[PDB]
Amino acid sequence: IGIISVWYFLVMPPIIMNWLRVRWYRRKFFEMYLQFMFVFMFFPGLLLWAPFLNFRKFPRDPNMKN
Amino acid sequence: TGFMNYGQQTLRAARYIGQGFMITLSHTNRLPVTIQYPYTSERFRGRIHFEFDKCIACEVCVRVCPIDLPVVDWKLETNIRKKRLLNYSIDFGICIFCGNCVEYCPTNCLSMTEEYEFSTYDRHELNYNQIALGRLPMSVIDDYTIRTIWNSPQTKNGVN
Amino acid sequence: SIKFPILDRTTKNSVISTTLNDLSNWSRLSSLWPLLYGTSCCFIEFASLRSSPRQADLILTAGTVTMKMAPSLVRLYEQMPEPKYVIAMGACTITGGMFSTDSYSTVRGVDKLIPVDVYLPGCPPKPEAVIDAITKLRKKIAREIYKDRIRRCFTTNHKFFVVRSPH
Amino acid sequence: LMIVNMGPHHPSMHGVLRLIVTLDGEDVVDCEPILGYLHRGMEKIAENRAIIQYLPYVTRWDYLATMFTEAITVNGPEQLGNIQVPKRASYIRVIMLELSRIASHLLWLGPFMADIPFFYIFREREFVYDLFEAATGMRMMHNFFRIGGIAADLPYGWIDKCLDFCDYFLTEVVEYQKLITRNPIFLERVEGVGIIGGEEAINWGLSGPMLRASGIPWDLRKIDRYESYDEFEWEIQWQKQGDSLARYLVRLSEMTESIKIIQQALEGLPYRFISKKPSPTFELSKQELYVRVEAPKGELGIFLIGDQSGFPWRWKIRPPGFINLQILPELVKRMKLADIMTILGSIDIIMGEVDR
Amino acid sequence: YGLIWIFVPIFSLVLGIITGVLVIVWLEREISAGIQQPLGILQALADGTKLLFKENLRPSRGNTPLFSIGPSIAVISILLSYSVIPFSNHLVLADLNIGIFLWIAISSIAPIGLLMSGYGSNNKYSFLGGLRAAAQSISYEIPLTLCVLSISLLSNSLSTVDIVEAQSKYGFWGWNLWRQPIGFIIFLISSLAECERLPFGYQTEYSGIKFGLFYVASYLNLLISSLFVTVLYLGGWNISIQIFGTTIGIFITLAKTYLFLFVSIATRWTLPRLRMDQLLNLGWKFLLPISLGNLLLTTSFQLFS
Amino acid sequence: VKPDIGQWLQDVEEHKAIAIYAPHEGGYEGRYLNRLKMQGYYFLDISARGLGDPETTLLKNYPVCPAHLGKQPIARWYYPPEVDYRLAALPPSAKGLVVWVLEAKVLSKSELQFLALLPSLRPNVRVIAECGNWRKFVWKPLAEIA
Amino acid sequence: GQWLSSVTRHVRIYAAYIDPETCESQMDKLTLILDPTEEFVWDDESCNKVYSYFQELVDHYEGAPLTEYTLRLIGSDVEHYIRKMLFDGEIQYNMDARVLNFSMGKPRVQ
Numbered sequence A: 001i002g003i004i005s006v007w008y009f010l011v012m013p014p015i016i017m018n019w020l021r022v023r024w025y026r027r028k029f030f031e032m033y034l035q036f037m038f039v040f041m042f043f044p045g046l047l048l049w050a051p052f053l054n055f056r057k058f059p060r061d062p063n064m065k066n
Numbered sequence B: 001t002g003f004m005n006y007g008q009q010t011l012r013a014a015r016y017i018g019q020g021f022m023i024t025l026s027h028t029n030r031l032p033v034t035i036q037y038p039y040t041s042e043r044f045r046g047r048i049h050f051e052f053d054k055c056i057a058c059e060v061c062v063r064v065c066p067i068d069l070p071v072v073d074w075k076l077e078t079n080i081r082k083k084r085l086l087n088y089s090i091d092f093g094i095c096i097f098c099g100n101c102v103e104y105c106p107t108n109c110l111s112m113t114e115e116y117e118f119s120t121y122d123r124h125e126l127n128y129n130q131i132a133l134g135r136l137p138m139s140v141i142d143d144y145t146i147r148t149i150w151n152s153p154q155t156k157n158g159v160n
Numbered sequence C: 001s002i003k004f005p006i007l008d009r010t011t012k013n014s015v016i017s018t019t020l021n022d023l024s025n026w027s028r029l030s031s032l033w034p035l036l037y038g039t040s041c042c043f044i045e046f047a048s049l050r051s052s053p054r055q056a057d058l059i060l061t062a063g064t065v066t067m068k069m070a071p072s073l074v075r076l077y078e079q080m081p082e083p084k085y086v087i088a089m090g091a092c093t094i095t096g097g098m099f100s101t102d103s104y105s106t107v108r109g110v111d112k113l114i115p116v117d118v119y120l121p122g123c124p125p126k127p128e129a130v131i132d133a134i135t136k137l138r139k140k141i142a143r144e145i146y147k148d149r150i151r152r153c154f155t156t157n158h159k160f161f162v163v164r165s166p167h
Numbered sequence D: 001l002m003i004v005n006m007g008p009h010h011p012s013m014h015g016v017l018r019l020i021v022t023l024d025g026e027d028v029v030d031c032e033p034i035l036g037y038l039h040r041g042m043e044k045i046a047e048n049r050a051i052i053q054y055l056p057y058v059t060r061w062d063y064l065a066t067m068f069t070e071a072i073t074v075n076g077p078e079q080l081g082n083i084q085v086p087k088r089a090s091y092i093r094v095i096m097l098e099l100s101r102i103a104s105h106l107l108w109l110g111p112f113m114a115d116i117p118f119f120y121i122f123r124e125r126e127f128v129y130d131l132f133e134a135a136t137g138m139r140m141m142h143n144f145f146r147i148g149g150i151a152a153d154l155p156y157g158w159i160d161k162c163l164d165f166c167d168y169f170l171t172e173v174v175e176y177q178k179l180i181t182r183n184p185i186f187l188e189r190v191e192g193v194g195i196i197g198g199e200e201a202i203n204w205g206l207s208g209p210m211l212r213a214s215g216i217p218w219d220l221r222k223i224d225r226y227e228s229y230d231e232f233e234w235e236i237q238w239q240k241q242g243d244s245l246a247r248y249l250v251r252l253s254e255m256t257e258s259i260k261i262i263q264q265a266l267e268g269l270p271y272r273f274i275s276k277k278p279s280p281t282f283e284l285s286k287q288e289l290y291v292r293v294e295a296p297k298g299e300l301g302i303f304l305i306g307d308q309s310g311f312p313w314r315w316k317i318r319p320p321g322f323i324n325l326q327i328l329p330e331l332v333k334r335m336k337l338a339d340i341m342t343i344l345g346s347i348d349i350i351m352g353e354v355d356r
Numbered sequence E: 001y002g003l004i005w006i007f008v009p010i011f012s013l014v015l016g017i018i019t020g021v022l023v024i025v026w027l028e029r030e031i032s033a034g035i036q037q038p039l040g041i042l043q044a045l046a047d048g049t050k051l052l053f054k055e056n057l058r059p060s061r062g063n064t065p066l067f068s069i070g071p072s073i074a075v076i077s078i079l080l081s082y083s084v085i086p087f088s089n090h091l092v093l094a095d096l097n098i099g100i101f102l103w104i105a106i107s108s109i110a111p112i113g114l115l116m117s118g119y120g121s122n123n124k125y126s127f128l129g130g131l132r133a134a135a136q137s138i139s140y141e142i143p144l145t146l147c148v149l150s151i152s153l154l155s156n157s158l159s160t161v162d163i164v165e166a167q168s169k170y171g172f173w174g175w176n177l178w179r180q181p182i183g184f185i186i187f188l189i190s191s192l193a194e195c196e197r198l199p200f201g202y203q204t205e206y207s208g209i210k211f212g213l214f215y216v217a218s219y220l221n222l223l224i225s226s227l228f229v230t231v232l233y234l235g236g237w238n239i240s241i242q243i244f245g246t247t248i249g250i251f252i253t254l255a256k257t258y259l260f261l262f263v264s265i266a267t268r269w270t271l272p273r274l275r276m277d278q279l280l281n282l283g284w285k286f287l288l289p290i291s292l293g294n295l296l297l298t299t300s301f302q303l304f305s
Numbered sequence F: 001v002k003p004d005i006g007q008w009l010q011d012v013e014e015h016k017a018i019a020i021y022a023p024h025e026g027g028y029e030g031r032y033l034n035r036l037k038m039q040g041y042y043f044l045d046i047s048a049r050g051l052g053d054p055e056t057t058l059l060k061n062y063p064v065c066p067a068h069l070g071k072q073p074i075a076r077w078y079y080p081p082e083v084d085y086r087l088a089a090l091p092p093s094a095k096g097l098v099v100w101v102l103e104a105k106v107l108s109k110s111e112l113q114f115l116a117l118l119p120s121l122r123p124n125v126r127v128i129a130e131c132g133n134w135r136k137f138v139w140k141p142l143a144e145i146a
Numbered sequence G: 001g002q003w004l005s006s007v008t009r010h011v012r013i014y015a016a017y018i019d020p021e022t023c024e025s026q027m028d029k030l031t032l033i034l035d036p037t038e039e040f041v042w043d044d045e046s047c048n049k050v051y052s053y054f055q056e057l058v059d060h061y062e063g064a065p066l067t068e069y070t071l072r073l074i075g076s077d078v079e080h081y082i083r084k085m086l087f088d089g090e091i092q093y094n095m096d097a098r099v100l101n102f103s104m105g106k107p108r109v110q
Ligand code: SF4
Pocket: B054, B055, B056, B057, B058, B059, B060, B061, B062, B105, B106, B107, B108, B109, B110
């Protein structure tokens, strides 16, 4: 069960959060309904992915002018 | 048959709850707009842009103001009609941005901008100078987190 | 002309204690949750952005405060006394607003009534101005390390009876 | 008889007010409305300020519809000096005043439906404030009323959005009309209150929705020939059901009547921005002039005794809703703590014009 | 070994219900961000630590033991009855011969915490609010335990794992949605209405950790009512129309409790307060007689079984 | 997030002029200010969104000019300076430096930011903690463009 | 109602049964709470001087009805006395609160 636990706690949560990102607007309320059910079922694996956020913000083709 | 009338009232109630549930389920489909943080036209009347050498005489900002807040000291220079203006002190805690002297200026060096991010940590910091009031705020197209704000259009559904 | 602090040392200088202080401060800077406090022209930002008057310590004063409003306001701050502060989100919570000269029944700012961290431009700005204000406040609380839990009560009182004349 | 405090932070959000009641049990029987909370002293400062300086001050009265306050306080000096407004700017003023009446009634029924949600009306309100931004530029803090009309001109996008507002707005209005016929909780939770009739609402002080709730076709701008009201389509609510749902049908019919007025005024276009502007500064005369306009709450009024100076010698305002607040001491006698929320909703009042 | 294997289902269950109340907080925030238009997942723990690290805020009233244990009993009255849920054919906390009956007792000791809250607060506001909250916890208990009784009468068992197995005989139609939809409506209105959620304070002196206790007690009340929606009407782990059966069954019952969370929060946002008179008109003159009515119906119907 | 390193403290004690490129994503900015405050220092605040002539405001006792509401006179008095009075606002001796926390990178003028960074080089106990125009991550670039 | 006070910064009337910091119920015992916000230094001898001055002011200014207007007058000239005491340097500031707004203006070089 430790193999299945690290599988469900490592492979699942970035794909789950990615499906939460890329399907935030492209959804029926049926689709938002099943996504809400999925994110309710799939909560405590998202603890190692909650503070880290890397591929999130570039809605252009900009340059790092900082 | 009073409990039958209670049942008929709840039948009409269940019909209304189902119809209003369809209405609210359709109301939950407001996906494209979603106003939030970024993470208007020229008459925003936000932060007031000021120019120092174009400000010359008539002191109309201290007169048409509803509270008379502007404090500008001036000493007349001889034979050249120069008032020697100094320290254009505007307190935005005193200021309402109600906009009288913005359009009532004879010089019209008072113009408005779109800046409103003046939430500060102290009240004595709000006493601004004439060089702080001459700063171009922001070109809001040129941010990596701000897209085009839906000014002319509405419900574009183009971000997705 | 100011006073002098103590400034002896920082006793909690382990990695675990400063880690817990940083995490508790950042989570304290994350969970604003205001009790709203509208009932004025700055209530209009609430629809774009509890009821127990001792719960929410991170309230911002988004309202036009008057002299008759002031006893209930200082009682409500007595109901939020120790942990957190208030944010002035109105020119009338700062300078008295547009009636700063001639208004008798309106206080010239709550800066003579309550400790205020952040002063706003005042009259209803855009709904992201309150977001920038609570972000600044989060940067302010992030500077705070909970003052190393350092405590003083004055307790000034006269037990002589006043020359009273009630109704 | 446990005394309710009725504190400053109400469980509802309709202003700050004081309604201490003895309430023997849950039946409220005696009302003592204490006011003075949102007070500014408009009269003495208005005596100490000019018209162009108390003209930014007319925003703190009925700020859910700010066109009415500045409209009546600019229509004061227009009829005082007998300066003619051209027909184009006056009709555009009629359009924006009826749009502000629309905004006042929808911003009433928003938090009223929230107490008894926000984005069910904000889908409309974002385009409504887009119309306010295309009309004057501000959200609700406009300063665009002159003696000759609007201070600026209408842009070429605002007339197109005004043409689009009718089939953007009336469809969701009539989708919101059928809810009270469908949903019986409005037929059982706000049904009943408002038991005053017409001969009594004329008797005390009432005007607006509380006077049109009894089936009286009352209108100032129909009796007084003002802004050519008999040209446009009118249907003043003669709904005689009395109660609070009668007031809701009154407000739906007033919004639909304003929709009909604006829809007939979409293609009217009978004429510049400001007529009679030689100089930036002027004065006022000394007459005995009380000017009034059809408020959304009923006969907003401006009393004026002149000084022939830069300052008015007397400036007293008769607000509609503050005279409409007098009837609750009589509409408190046989109701509940669960009823006073519906009462202070159906008064349709904010405390900006109350204390002032 | 003598206590580790016994403690770890309790520990895993406490961690599971903390994650579930995190789900309920951020899921009501997500439905409010859908109907009202990452960092947000940890914002709920930030809420919990904002409510945790605070001031005690004790006034001058001399009811300090009741002031301490008021919100504590309000938490216990939900937390003690999480030993009851058969998430699968295994991983239930106890065998629990009286399954739902202990839940009815622990949910019935909740007005004790409500009256202890109404007396721990030296305020007439929270006094009247504790009276109202205790009275609506009392008032909505009877059709609640009536439809509980009717489902346990269909199953002829009180133990929850037995009724969860018993729902899977006819198949998809064997669930109690198609056996008692009327009693399902009873359990819907009793689940939504009791927790001061579907109609509507009384925390005007409780602050700091006690306000957080009332917070977590209300949302765990929502959690346990939702998990009984799962294990009564929707099914525990059966989708008919080793180790992996437990792992798929916990996903099935969590999808069912997410379904009821979405239905409950949506019905909260689309219904207002019953204004406290139709509330009791419902729970006494309407809801209790029709709960007795479908009790008589299921009593007549179990003769042939 | 939360990369455990005090390299920003090394930058503020080495360069003492760093643009804090950090978003409006909550309070992820004051943690290094809290570590400077826990080191015995004292940190006060400023903002360049309405600060004009910054060297004439931090020194040279810029004027008070109280805003009369049409009732009082001009009363051209001289208020004490910003950072000179802040150096006068250190009553004990254990305070090693004074941190000037600036939180407005826009409306700043590149020339005047270099003038303010040179004013952080004027007093040895002055630390410049300016903003960095709100990048997505937390970047501590030094005053190179200014 | 029950609160009868004119409470500002550094001056709070609070005519209630307050011996210690626990509020109550209301009586003729005016409990002058000073400095709620930790704005100035407020040494104990100077606090005793200001409290004795306020006692002399409420002793010489009574005789009329002690309603709210006398409370406004006595808090107002008590704040004038605190301002003229801090301007002469008897009351320094604090710089230990999170604001330190310098509510009475910066002391000049005069
Ligand atoms: S800016 Fe306006 S008020 Fe100032 S001197 Fe010029 S004309 Fe006069």
